């Protein structure tokens, strides 16, 4: 996250870190046994880390649980990033409490101007590399489809939305992928892609979760 602030330990209880010997993507806990993340974060050997703040030090409240299976959307296209969403089933149920809780799925899509919270352990510099130890937060509004399509002509499908600031300086970045975009207490987006980070006229692009609620529920129900 570029241009954000320190969230505060466990203030984003649904935030998870996907780890394979190092942090590589974020994700959101949607119930005691399932995490939602981005399809491009897929890999074997994923350990899900819940209740994290400083990802480099064990401080208490952490729960490390192995992924039992990862389900990438059948129509995910790596070339266009359309349908960039993945479900991860945990090997055992997480213990839910004040420091580890799930986030609700949306019943309706959000509209332009809606304020949301994006969080993650990604790069904090628009130019260069600097990974934080603690979870960073950023409040950002959802942009209109017309502004989104103007920024990325021919690259925005109906399953994506832009969020952020056209003036630059505030954005999600490498390492934030798969993480949550929460608005009004509902998970509306998943950190997916963008051109650089915090660049002027190049807002972040996110997977539009409200288009997948049915798929998520049916998939979870049969697994």
């Amino acid at each position: 996250i570029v241009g954000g602030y320190t969230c505060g330990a466990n203030t984003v209880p649904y935030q998870v870190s996907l780890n394979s010997g190092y942090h590589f993507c974020g994700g959101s806990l949607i119930n005691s046994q399932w995490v939602v993340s981005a399809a491009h974060c897929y890999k074997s050997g994923i350990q899900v880390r819940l209740g994290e703040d400083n990802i480099n030090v064990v401080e208490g409240n952490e729960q490390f649980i192995s992924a039992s299976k990862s389900i990438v959307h059948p129509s995910y296209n790596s070339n266009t990033l359309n349908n960039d969403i993945m479900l991860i089933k945990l090997k055992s149920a997480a213990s839910l409490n004040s420091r580890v809780a799930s986030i609700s799925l949306p019943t309706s899509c959000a509209s332009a101007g809606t304020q949301c919270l994006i969080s993650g352990w990604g790069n904090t510099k628009s130019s260069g590399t600097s990974y934080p130890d603690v979870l960073k937060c950023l409040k950002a509004p959802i942009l209109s489809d017309s502004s989104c399509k103007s920024a990325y002509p021919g690259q925005i499908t109906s399953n994506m939305f832009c969020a952020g600031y056209l003036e630059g300086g505030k954005d999600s970045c490498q390492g934030d992928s798969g993480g949550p975009v929460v608005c009004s207490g509902k998970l509306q987006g998943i950190v997916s892609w963008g051109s650089g980070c915090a660049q002027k006229n190049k807002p972040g692009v996110y997977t539009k979760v409200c288009n997948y609620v049915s798929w998520i529920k049916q998939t979870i129900a049969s697994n």
């Binding site: 190092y22 942090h23 590589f24 993507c25 981005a38 491009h40 974060c41 790596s78 990033l81 960039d84 990604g122 990325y152 690259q155 999600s172 970045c173 490498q174 390492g175 934030d176 992928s177 798969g178 950190v191 997916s192 892609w193 963008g194 051109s195 650089g196 980070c197 972040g204």
Partner: peptide
């Protein structure tokens, strides 16, 4: 444009 994972996919 790149995905925001580690490492990024462009």
């Amino acid at each position: 444009s790149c995905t925001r994972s580690i490492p990024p996919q462009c």
